[PDB]
Amino acid sequence: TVSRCGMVWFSEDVLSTDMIFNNFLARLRSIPLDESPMLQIQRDAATIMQPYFTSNGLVTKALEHAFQLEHIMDLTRLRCLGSLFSMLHQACRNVAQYNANHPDFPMQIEQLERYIQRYLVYAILWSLSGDSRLKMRAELGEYIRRITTVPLPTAPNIPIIDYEVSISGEWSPWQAKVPQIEVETHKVAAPDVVVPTLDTVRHEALLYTWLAEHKPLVLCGPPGSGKTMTLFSALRALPDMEVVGLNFSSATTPELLLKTFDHYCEYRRTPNGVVLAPVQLGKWLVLFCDEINLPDMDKYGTQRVISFIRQMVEHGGFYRTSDQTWVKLERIQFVGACNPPT
Ligand SMILES: Nc1ncnc2c1ncn2[C@@H]1O[C@H](COP(=O)(O)OP(=O)(O)OP(=O)(O)O)[C@@H](O)[C@H]1O
Numbered sequence: 005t006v007s008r009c010g011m012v013w014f015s016e017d018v019l020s021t022d023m024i025f026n027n028f029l030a031r032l033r034s035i036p037l038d039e040s041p042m043l044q045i046q047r048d049a050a051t052i053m054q055p056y057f058t059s060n061g062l063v064t065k066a067l068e069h070a071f072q073l074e075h076i077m078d079l080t081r082l083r084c085l086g087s088l089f090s091m092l093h094q095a096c097r098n099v100a101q102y103n104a105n106h107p108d109f110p111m112q113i114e115q116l117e118r119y120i121q122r123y124l125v126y127a128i129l130w131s132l133s134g135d136s137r138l139k140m141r142a143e144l145g146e147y148i149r150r151i152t153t154v155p156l157p158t159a160p161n162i163p164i165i166d167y168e169v170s171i172s173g174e175w176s177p178w179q180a181k182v183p184q185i186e187v188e189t190h191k192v193a194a195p196d197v198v199v200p201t202l203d204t205v206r207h208e209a210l211l212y213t214w215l216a217e218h219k220p221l222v223l224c225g226p227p228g229s230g231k232t233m234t235l236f237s238a239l240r241a242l243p244d245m246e247v248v249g250l251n252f253s254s255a256t257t258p259e260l261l262l263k264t265f266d267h268y269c270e271y272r273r274t275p276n277g278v279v280l281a282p283v284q285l286g287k288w289l290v291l292f293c294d295e296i297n298l299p300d301m302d303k304y305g306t307q308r309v310i311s312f313i314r315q316m317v318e319h320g321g322f323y324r325t326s327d328q329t330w331v332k333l334e335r336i337q338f339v340g341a342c343n344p345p346t
């Protein structure tokens with residue numbers, strides 16, 4: 005079959021990093037997040053972040069070092085860049101929300117610049133090295149502190165990752181965000197209790213950010229670490245996002261996903277075409293996959309189910325085999341979890 009048709013090879017020199025950077029910046033400057041004031045705030049934010057997105061810029065050096073490190077899953081450059089762009093989009097949404105809650109005093113250019121710079125640094129930290137050990141995140145933080153010019157927390161030993169940037173554009177510790185809950189006497193060691201702490205509040209913010217953009221994500225880490233629990237707490241805390249836990253097995257097939265879809269969603273005919281919508285209105289059906297990487301590869305190194313989620317995440321839809329018709333996904337997003345592949 006290789007010799008039965010032509011060929012073209014696209015190496016990874018085809019997209020220079022600056023190519024992706026210019027695509028992201030142009031798409032942000034043109035299209036608005038909601039679907040105009042927020043386009044104006046996007047333009048201002050992009051004007052702020054342009055100096056760090058140039059060739060031989062802060063993001064490029066940070067990315068090459070993150071490649072020099074080790075990550076729990078296979079590090080792909082576009083994965084890091086797409087995560088960073090999604091989190092920057094959420095930063096712009098946060099600025100828009102702050103403006104909406106303060107009609108008298110819209111956030112000025114100086115505060116916007118400070119917030120965007122600090123969010124960019126924190127975003128690099130949590131996107132490039134968010135899938136590494138704590139020590140490797142510390143190494144990346146030390147590097148980026150060495151090479152960047154953005155002001156950073158002056159904690160003598162606390163790495164920047166434990167810090168957060170306030171909507172007022174200031175470096176504030178994540179510790180203050182952690183409350184002190186008093187669980188009831190009969191609720192000790194309960195299957196649902198979630199004591200807030202540094203890790204779960206940071207992961208709460210990250211889950212909120214990557215779920216607002218409807219970017220699917222998978223939690224990685226050693227068995228019994230607080231991953232499934234933190235995810236469920238976040239998802240239940242979510243206002244209008246139903247949660248559908250799904251225990252993927254080694255015998256998992258996309259047929260199971262279709263079963264869940266017909267159980268919770270329904271097919272309706274719209275002028276664009278057949279559209280998948282969850283039955284209950286205004287709800288982002290978040291399909292939790294307990295063990296995303298568990299399903300077996302075939303003899304040709306392909307997990308059919310993960311191919312299905314890739315198809316639906318990228319193309320924004322799938323094909324209904326009943327009538328071989330394109331079905332677009334509406335109000336559906338995915339989150340998974342898995343221990344390291346080792
Ligand atoms: N911050 C916390 N507050 C309360 N309990 C916690 C906290 N962090 C972890 N735990 C407890 O530790 C365990 C963490 O479970 P976890 O959510 O990691 O499971 P899991 O994702 O299903 O595991 P696995 O990968 O082995 O299948 C639970 O028993 C949970 O109650």
